[PDB]
């Protein structure tokens, strides 16, 4: 699950009742696919800036 | 920073750093929102009034991104003890908002369980700063980053001559001459994870900079996620 490969999620990844949850820092948001993590705005946490 | 290499324009955007009246940097610190600071909490001794500098990254001019922020609140920790550098972590609230920007972003803080399990089971960390560049040289001008492999906790508490606690974790090289040093305490230890940092751990000490068979110590953020949670809402 979480220790395949992150469970395929970008960031925190929880085993809940035997199956994979994803989840995202402060600023994001999860995706679609319930996996990725997008920002929420120009200057997302952790992400170096290359304007 | 010793035997680093130089933070690139935005590679190094949550790095602060804490700033004496005479303008002298001392200590580093790592943005974690528009109004906090994650710093050591050590670093409140070497000053009687300091405030924070973020978007810098050479001492020797302006580039124009730079910002100097007062600071309103510190928090230090109630349990931090100078003797034995345990609890080595505090938060400062900045009087005013910080406008992220090039070179001036915040780093994410992880959880907990998630952060120890996949973030420092990672092989490398980032630590970067304005610290010395050699252990009995002067603090640098540029700022630095190093990366920094997670050293198995057993081998670090066996090479440390002071108690390793719970609350600090060892990265660095054995004989490799590349480690923190003094003026980096209080920065950034980040990790990676698929193009996002987080935040991992505080430059905290070691014994001497570089030296073989010894460690650099980092105080151990994920065991203060709580801690820093109640610190930035009140
Ligand atoms: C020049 O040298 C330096 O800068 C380092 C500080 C320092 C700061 C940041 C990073 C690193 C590092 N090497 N990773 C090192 C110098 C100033 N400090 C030390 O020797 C040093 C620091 C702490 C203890 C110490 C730790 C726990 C308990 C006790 C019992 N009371 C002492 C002992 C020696
Ligand atoms: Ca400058």
Redesign the interface.
Known sequence: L?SLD?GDC?????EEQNSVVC?C???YTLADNGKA?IPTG?????????? | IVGGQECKDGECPWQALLINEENEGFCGGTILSEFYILTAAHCLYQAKRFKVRVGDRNTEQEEGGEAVHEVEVVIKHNRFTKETYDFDIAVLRLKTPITFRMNVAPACLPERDWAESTLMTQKTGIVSGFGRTHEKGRQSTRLKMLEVPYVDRNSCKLSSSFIITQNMFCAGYDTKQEDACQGDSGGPHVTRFKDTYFVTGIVSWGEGCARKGKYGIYTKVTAFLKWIDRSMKT
Do not use: I, M, V, W
């Not at chain 1, 120009?42 to 304007?51: D, I, M, N, R, S």
């Open positions: 979480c992150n970008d960031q925190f990844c929880h989840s820092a402060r600023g993590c120009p200057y997302p946490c952790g992400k170096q800036t290359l304007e």
